[PDB]
Design a protein around this ligand. Structure first.
Ligand SMILES: Nc1ccn([C@@H]2O[C@H](COP(=O)(O)OP(=O)(O)O)[C@@H](O)[C@H]2O)c(=O)n1
Length: 221
């Protein structure tokens, strides 16, 4: 046969990570965190002293990327050149370089096959920005998860406060809107929902409500 795919695209902080984890465990399917791929590439670029603003330098790197994602266990592992870098790919230095690296056409092309190879029995839950528009446009189920920038800033703020970091609302809001513009105003694979995508706005919905509506739509298809 051929493996079914559910694509979940959306902006930063929309809750994609949580939803993809809940669905993959519910359905007992495979999970693809596409953002982690651009993040590992960026980190390997930072470590190997490759200029992140140079498409020519990045290609040999993207095409020779030694990385493994260790099979869901309950928590996910990202292994770069044999080292577990799961925590390091989540730092600001990496997320920043990742947006630059992601903006190159030839870099994105070098990563297509790698991503598509995740589609396997019994199915794939793909998390990203362009899963339903570029990598899996043939996806039978497409969901575009969104939320207001103000709500997303508030959510990020409460997270930081739980960890004991000082932050003020105004800066978080400016930071997420900048991430939005770069994602949406991107010339290559910009953040735009698929024509056949279920637009799911979580602004005033709880995590359980998002999950429930997601799995119902998916099963009803
Ligand atoms: N399918 C994807 C996934 C991520 N990305 C980029 O990867 C970088 C970060 O991935 P992420 O979504 O895991 O983290 P944030 O940028 O939301 O902080 C972002 O700059 C995204 O635009 C992409 O271009 N295409």
């Amino acid at each position: 046969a051929i493996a079914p795919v559910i694509t979940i695209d959306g902006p930063s902080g929309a809750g994609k990570g949580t939803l993809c984890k809940a669905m993959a465990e519910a359905l007992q399917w495979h999970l693809l965190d596409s953002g982690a791929i651009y993040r590992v590439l960026a980190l390997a670029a930072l470590h190997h002293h490759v200029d992140v603003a140079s498409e020519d330098a990045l290609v040999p790197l993207a095409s020779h990327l030694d990385v493994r994602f260790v099979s869901t266990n309950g928590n996910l592992e990202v292994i770069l050149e044999g080292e577990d870098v799961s925590g390091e790919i989540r730092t600001q230095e990496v997320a920043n370089a990742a947006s630059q690296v992601a903006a190159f056409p030839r870099v994105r092309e070098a990563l297509l096959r790698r991503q598509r190879a995740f589609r396997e029995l019994p199915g794939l839950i793909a998390d990203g920005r362009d899963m339903g528009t570029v990598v899996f446009p043939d996806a039978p189920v497409k969901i575009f998860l969104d939320a207001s920038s103000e709500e997303r800033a508030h959510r990020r703020m409460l997270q930081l406060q739980e960890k004991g970091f000082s932050v003020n609302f105004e800066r978080l809001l400016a930071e997420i809107k900048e991430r939005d513009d770069r994602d949406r105003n991107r010339a290559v694979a910009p953040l735009v929902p698929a024509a056949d995508a279920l637009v799911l706005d979580s602004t005033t919905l709880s995590i359980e409500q998002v999950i429930e509506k997601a799995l119902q739509y998916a099963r009803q298809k």
